[PDB]
């Protein structure tokens, strides 16, 4: 008949977070499952109307329909300030190719409305490429684009256990590309990997290897919009670093240019981690299903492939991917009666100027 879901959390990257939704499995004798979901945190307020048939065809191919609104405040995400009020629709066909893999192709539309953009080099460079000529001295700028996209997704998940795996792998690869007629013209791809290799019969000692990769760029003069950039740093990418701090920093124009510590992301990104999961001290091995200890080496880099270091010779070369950030630490996780609790302590041993260290990082509930 339906379902109401409510979730709450606190994280050092996104502050307090809410998750709420309601669904009807056969809304007014239509056969499709209509739903409404929301999300709020320090920097984003999302909402959407969904309508999904779980068995569109007998083969198992589904047809999902989405209608959304989204508000994003960049300074509340540790980035150079901007505001993106976006809204749109997405249609997606889901193909369960087998019990471990699933694919998904879809079409989309997104209206993006930028505002409150302090004049900075990487952001203005993109605005110039789009035909805008904003003032290099006025804090009050706006920009609107209407894009159409083809979206692709692949999810592989051959893990033994959903929460606290000891063996197997998970891969997620998403892609998207603008369709002609769109204001922007770019592609964007992301790759996420997780591999658990147990080093003992009882699976109490497990080596976990993770990677995250991102690459996006323009097609025909236009650059990828800065609102679609990649980021690294935070408890979910490179522990020990403040959320999104890694990579290029805003070079502001005078209100000669100011170099800064405010992160701006980039169109390229790479993150690798090696984690050794162990039995928890002072706790029994019967609780490894709900408590987990681990030691890790995290590292990542984010770069701007269009940063022209020839004309910005004094400032750092942000098109250089060789500035590999690194950290080492210990993590503790507990599936508590309040949901998943994760506490980590990492000391960044290799950091570039601008990078902000956040040694203690903690997450409880949904994030």
């Amino acid at each position: 008949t339906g379902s109401f879901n409510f979730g709450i959390g606190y994280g050092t990257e996104s502050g307090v977070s809410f998750q709420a939704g309601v669904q009807q499995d056969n809304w007014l004798g239509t056969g499709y499952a209509v739903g409404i979901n929301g999300t709020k945190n320090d920097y984003q307020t999302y909402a959407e109307l969904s309508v999904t048939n779980p068995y569109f065809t007998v083969d198992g191919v589904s047809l999902g329909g989405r209608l959304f609104y989204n508000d994003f405040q960049a300074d509340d995400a540790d980035l150079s300030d901007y505001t993106n009020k976006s809204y749109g629709t997405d249609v997606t066909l889901g193909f369960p190719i087998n019990e471990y893999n699933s694919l998904r192709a879809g079409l989309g539309y997104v209206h993006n409305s930028l505002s409150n953009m302090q004049p900075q080099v990487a952001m203005w460079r993109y605005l110039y490429s789009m035909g805008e000529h904003p003032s290099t001295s006025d804090q009050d700028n706006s920009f609107k684009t209407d894009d159409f996209t083809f979206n692709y997704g692949w999810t592989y998940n051959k893990l033994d256990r959903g929460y606290f795996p000891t063996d197997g792998s998970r891969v997620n690869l998403t892609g998207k590309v603008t369709i002609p007629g769109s204001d922007n013209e770019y592609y964007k791809v992301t790759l996420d990997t997780a591999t658990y290799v147990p080093i003992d019969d009882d699976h109490k000692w497990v080596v976990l290897g993770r990677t995250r990769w991102g690459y996006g760029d323009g097609l025909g003069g236009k650059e990828m919009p800065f609102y679609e950039n990649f980021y690294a740093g935070g408890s979910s990418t490179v522990r020990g670093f403040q959320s999104n701090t890694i990579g290029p920093k805003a070079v502001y124009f005078p209100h000669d240019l100011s170099k800064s510590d405010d992160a701006v992301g980039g169109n390229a990104m790479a993150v690798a981690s090696l984690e050794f999961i162990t039995p928890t001290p002072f706790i029994s091995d019967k609780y490894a299903n709900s408590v987990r200890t681990s030691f890790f080496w995290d590292m990542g880099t984010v770069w701007d492939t269009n940063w022209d270091s020839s004309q910005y010779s004094g400032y750092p070369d942000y098109s250089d991917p060789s500035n590999i950030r690194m950290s080492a630490g210990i993590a503790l996780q507990w599936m508590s009666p309040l949901g998943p609790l994760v506490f980590s302590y990492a000391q960044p041993f290799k950091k570039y100027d601008g990078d902000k260290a956040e040694q203690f990082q903690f997450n409880i509930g949904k994030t």
Binding site: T1, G2, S3, F4, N5, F6, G7, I8, G9, Q19, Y163, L338, G339, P340, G365, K366
Partner: peptide, 10 residues
């Protein structure tokens, strides 16, 4: 992970 306060189906 999701709906840690209430995952209610009816």
């Amino acid at each position: 992970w999701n709906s840690n306060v209430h995952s209610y189906r009816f």
